[PDB]
């Protein structure tokens, strides 16, 4: 697959999306699913196409795993790349830091020459601030499974298919 979908979680919702984002593109033969816990910085080199996957948790901080590996992404060559995110959070709870990890990862990763694509605009939200707001867009899909569960279905599907175009599909 050309196609690298690497994620982390802490209590399973991130990896529940990520799974729906793989179903959403076609299968296993178009994304190759990772929890980011198995893998080696370097395995993200294989690439030209990323979709990373980041929960934030304890106010503002990454889920651990990306956490342990942020880093070594400096090793990484991105230089070239196309990269999505997404990532669950909770608007309410976190209202002033609701998914700041993917603005951490993303701000990171694209300083490091990669092109980031698949941004999702902010309408339906209610949220303070967010470090993933880029021109009132989110860098990428935002999920709120705690507070927007029936949302999430659609959410996915929108977003995939918008995606399939910037990823040669
Ligand atoms: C104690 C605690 C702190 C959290 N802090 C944040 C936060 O700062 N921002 C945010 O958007 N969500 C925050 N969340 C919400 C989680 O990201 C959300 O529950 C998400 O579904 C967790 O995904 P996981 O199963 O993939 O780890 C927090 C959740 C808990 C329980």
Known sequence: AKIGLFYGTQTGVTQTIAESIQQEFGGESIVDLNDIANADASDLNAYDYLIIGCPTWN???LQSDWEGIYDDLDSVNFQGKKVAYFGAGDQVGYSDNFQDAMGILEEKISSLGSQTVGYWPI?????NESKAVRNNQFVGLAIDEDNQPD???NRIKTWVSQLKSEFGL
């Open 59 to 61: 106010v503002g901080e």
């Open 151 to 153: 949302l999430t279905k």
């Open 123 to 127: 309408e339906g939200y209610d949220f």
